[PDB]
Amino acid sequence: MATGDERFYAEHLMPTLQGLLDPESAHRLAVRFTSLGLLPRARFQDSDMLEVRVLGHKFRNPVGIAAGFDKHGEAVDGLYKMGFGFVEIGSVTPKPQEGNPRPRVFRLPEDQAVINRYGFNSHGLSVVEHRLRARQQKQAKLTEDGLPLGVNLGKNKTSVDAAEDYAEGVRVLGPLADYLVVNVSSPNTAGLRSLQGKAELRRLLTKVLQERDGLRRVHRPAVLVKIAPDLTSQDKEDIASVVKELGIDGLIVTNTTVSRPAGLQGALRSETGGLSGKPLRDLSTQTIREMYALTQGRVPIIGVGGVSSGQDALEKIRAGASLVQLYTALTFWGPPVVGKVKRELEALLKEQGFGGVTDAIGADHRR
Numbered sequence: 001m002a003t004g005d006e007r008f009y010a011e012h013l014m015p016t017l018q019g020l021l022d023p024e025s026a027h028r029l030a031v032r033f034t035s036l037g038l039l040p041r042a043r044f045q046d047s048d049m050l051e052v053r054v055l056g057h058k059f060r061n062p063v064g065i066a067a068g069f070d071k072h073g074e075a076v077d078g079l080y081k082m083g084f085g086f087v088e089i090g091s092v093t094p095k096p097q098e099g100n101p102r103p104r105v106f107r108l109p110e111d112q113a114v115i116n117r118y119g120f121n122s123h124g125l126s127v128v129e130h131r132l133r134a135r136q137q138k139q140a141k142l143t144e145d146g147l148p149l150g151v152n153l154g155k156n157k158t159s160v161d162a163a164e165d166y167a168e169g170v171r172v173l174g175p176l177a178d179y180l181v182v183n184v185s186s187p188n189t190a191g192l193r194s195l196q197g198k199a200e201l202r203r204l205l206t207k208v209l210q211e212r213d214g215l216r217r218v219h220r221p222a223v224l225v226k227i228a229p230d231l232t233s234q235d236k237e238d239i240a241s242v243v244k245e246l247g248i249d250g251l252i253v254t255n256t257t258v259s260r261p262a263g264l265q266g267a268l269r270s271e272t273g274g275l276s277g278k279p280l281r282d283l284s285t286q287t288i289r290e291m292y293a294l295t296q297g298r299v300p301i302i303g304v305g306g307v308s309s310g311q312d313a314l315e316k317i318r319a320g321a322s323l324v325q326l327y328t329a330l331t332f333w334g335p336p337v338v339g340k341v342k343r344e345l346e347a348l349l350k351e352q353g354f355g356g357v358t359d360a361i362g363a364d365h366r367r
């Protein structure tokens, strides 16, 4: 196949919207529309070849919405409707906070990229908890039906105890989540990425895991750590070592990059913030590949960064990802991108002689 809506969105609707509205306004409107289920028809029907079992769950397809689109858990059901196999909300911080001053998001159209410096704009734990609670049973059913929910946790700008911020998040939202993410890789909170270093991480993660283990069984989420694409080889080794020592459930690979790859064309390339989309794609993929190897393929990875096609998804899966996420591609191609990626991925799995996604995970390593 290959669709009318895909072409219409790509060639007319999205460019027109970007023309009318700055990126943060467009994002806010998109959250609203999605929250109301005002979406183009998602014709694609997930086949069994797309199902994955990981992280204590069944995932009907392996394509999720990355953190940052639904920061505050306002559009979860709309996102499933859009065809994502799983939804991750957040980052959520303990107390509400405004984030950085505007403008703080920038398009690089020539690069199929975005740069953001939101700074964990967040409604806070309390608000989000209540919002999730209002739909908790409906989510339990969705999760049973292979449509899990992740919650990504951040820390407030003025916090004097990062580990406590994460612990508070585990206590408040963990009971509502299939998986939690310790996001220690935003580039837009001072000092945060230092939490990726070995001693800090071990201390923070031990606390987080303790908190988690203290939740009742039916409310006990998987815990993953989301890492930057900008780590040294030493940092990566250290993270793998800690994940193994502590039994962390998985990794999310990667956040945005503070690098500016050679060749960027957008006028806005030198704006401060994290860069996402196509220029991030292979950097991301390579990081997955390295982490999979460092963890002996025993630690589930959710691969993210510059996925806008089936090939992109498959490349990450073959590199070691059990699941993938996308955000920036949505910002270019709109909702039809979801079915596009899934249709393309199913075709390529068939063409490469995989019985389904599961058979492709980590395949490059076994060559």
Ligand SMILES: Cc1cc2nc3c(=O)[nH]c(=O)nc-3n(C[C@H](O)[C@H](O)[C@H](O)COP(=O)(O)O)c2cc1C
Pocket (backbone or CB within 6 Å): 066, 067, 068, 069, 071, 090, 091, 105, 114, 116, 118, 120, 152, 183, 226, 254, 255, 256, 276, 277, 278, 280, 304, 305, 306, 307, 325, 326, 327, 328, 329
């Ligand atoms: C506007 C924007 C906001 C984001 N905010 C968050 C966040 O709150 N937490 C997080 O873990 N990642 C956040 N990210 C990163 C994405 O989850 C993802 O890791 C990254 O953008 C790479 O995927 P992509 O190239 O498909 O966008 C954000 C990304 C963008 C573009």
Ligand SMILES: O=C(O)c1[nH]c(=O)[nH]c(=O)c1CCc1ccc(-c2ccccc2)cc1
Pocket (backbone or CB within 6 Å): 018, 022, 023, 024, 026, 027, 028, 030, 033, 034, 038, 039, 040, 069, 105, 107, 114, 330, 331, 332, 334, 335
């Ligand atoms: O337009 C953007 O630049 C932008 N930037 C971001 O950083 N985040 C965003 O979310 C966006 C907007 C992307 C978007 C997503 C969904 C839609 C949509 C939703 C429902 C129905 C039709 C379109 C439209 C635009």
Ligand SMILES: CCCCCCCCCC[N+](C)(C)[O-]
Pocket (backbone or CB within 6 Å): 004, 005, 007, 008, 009, 011, 012
């Ligand atoms: C101005 C010359 C015509 C170019 C417009 C592009 C053709 C249609 C694009 C795809 N469609 C919107 C029909 O789905």
Ligand SMILES: CCCCCCCCCC[N+](C)(C)[O-]
Pocket (backbone or CB within 6 Å): 011, 012, 013, 015, 016
């Ligand atoms: C609310 C819709 C207002 C639309 C006004 C702009 C129409 C320009 C069409 C541009 N394009 C050829 C890319 O579709």
Ligand SMILES: CCCCCCCCCC[N+](C)(C)[O-]
Pocket (backbone or CB within 6 Å): 015, 016, 019, 020
């Ligand atoms: C109101 C300012 C002009 C924007 C009108 C909306 C259509 C913009 C489409 C731009 N472009 C031709 C590059 O697609």
Ligand SMILES: CCCCCCCCCC[N+](C)(C)[O-]
Pocket (backbone or CB within 6 Å): 017, 020, 021, 029
């Ligand atoms: C709402 C402020 C700017 C308008 C941008 C585009 C809105 C398009 C509305 C489409 N719809 C068919 C649902 O009415």
Ligand SMILES: CCCCCCCCCC[N+](C)(C)[O-]
Pocket (backbone or CB within 6 Å): 018, 019, 020, 021, 022
């Ligand atoms: C009814 C047409 C409304 C005029 C819209 C003016 C364009 C807004 C500027 C957005 N921008 C090009 C900076 O993205």
Ligand SMILES: CCCCCCCCCC[N+](C)(C)[O-]
Pocket (backbone or CB within 6 Å): 017, 026, 029, 030, 033, 037, 038, 039, 040, 041
């Ligand atoms: C955030 C920009 C949204 C603009 C276009 C919305 C199109 C909605 C189509 C709804 N329908 C249910 C009619 O498909």
Ligand SMILES: O=C(O)c1cc(=O)[nH]c(=O)[nH]1
Pocket (backbone or CB within 6 Å): 068, 091, 116, 117, 118, 119, 120, 121, 183, 185, 186, 187, 188, 255, 256, 274
């Ligand atoms: O809120 C942000 O600035 C944000 C958080 C995150 O983890 N990644 C990112 O690119 N932006």
Ligand SMILES: [Cl-]
Pocket (backbone or CB within 6 Å): 269, 270
């Ligand atoms: Cl420059």
